[PDB]
Write a protein that binds this DNA or RNA. Structure first.
Length: 209
DNA sequence: ATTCTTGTTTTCATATCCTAAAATTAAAGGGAAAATAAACAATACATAACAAAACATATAAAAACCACCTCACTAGCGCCCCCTGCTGGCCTCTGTGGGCACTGCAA
């Protein structure tokens, strides 16, 4: 949580090297990134959640995610994993996903996908001298595509699980600012758009905040 | 009457021209691997602008240095008794020199 971004990024790289050894032995593949299933990376997500819980020096993981951005690029785009570890009760036999842990994971997702859309660091870490390379912009575009197609699917039953949670709805409705809407015209998923519209209508008529 | 030169058509002849079948050869068409070039994007280098640090000047601020004044000390030479001891006449009291009257003795 240093104000100076290079110090924070170095600390986050150290943290990623240290506290992530569930199935990655910091060695070769075929057991390190993913074991071909929808399960190994769950525990990495788990001590991300626990680290955000214990880090009481911040109500938001914005600085933490920004520090852990470039070191864990492949891990932070695997949104489907903690998506099943948030909604549909995975086959790992773990405990119930705690409400405080649910809010922590949702805040982590807010941070990760907003840094996925816009690459500029937050205020205090800001520079203003940013130039976009071709690789940067193509990663941004296909990142936008994959998050759009993933989360037009996930947000309906996300809301259906968390309709009454005011702060979780407020956190979850910042991502649609970063959705390319013509993909809906190409993806033909306006029906899921309308389902989410009815769902957020239910939230609006159920919430007065 | 018989013999001899000269000019002009006839017909083989020998080079040439034309004709067509082979062959053939170069053009030319297409498949494909190099391949230079070019369009775009990234990195590094150089230039310009802004802000701050460093250098130089002025000024005055104690502050140091030098010279003059002043209040003493240090020499200096009379100045003035003052006391003490020798010296050179001075004078008068003893004392040195002498004239002479006087006496005791024994003629």
């Amino acid at each position: 949580y240093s104000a100076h971004r290079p110090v924070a990024v170095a600390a986050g790289e150290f943290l990623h090297k240290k506290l992530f050894s569930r199935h990655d032995p910091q060695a070769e593949e075929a057991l390190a990134k993913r074991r071909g299933r929808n399960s190994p990376n769950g525990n990495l997500i788990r001590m991300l959640v626990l680290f955000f819980l214990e880090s009481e020096l911040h109500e938001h993981a914005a600085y933490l995610v920004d520090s852990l951005w470039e070191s864990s690029q492949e891990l932070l785009k695997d949104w489907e994993c903690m998506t099943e570890l948030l909604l549909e009760e995975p086959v790992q036999g773990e405990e119930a996903m705690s409400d405080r842990q649910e809010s922590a994971l949702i805040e982590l997702m807010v941070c990760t996908i907003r840094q996925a859309a816009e690459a500029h660091p937050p205020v205090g870490r800001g520079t203003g001298k940013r130039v976009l390379t071709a690789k940067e912009r193509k990663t941004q575009i296909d990142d936008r595509n994959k998050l759009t197609e993933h989360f037009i699917i996930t947000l309906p039953m996300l809301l259906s699980k968390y309709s009454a949670d005011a702060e979780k709805v407020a956190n979850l409705l910042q991502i649609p600012q970063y959705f390319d809407l013509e993909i809906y015209s190409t993806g033909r998923m306006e029906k899921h758009l309308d389902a989410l519209l009815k769902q957020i209508k239910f939230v609006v008529e159920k919430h007065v905040e």
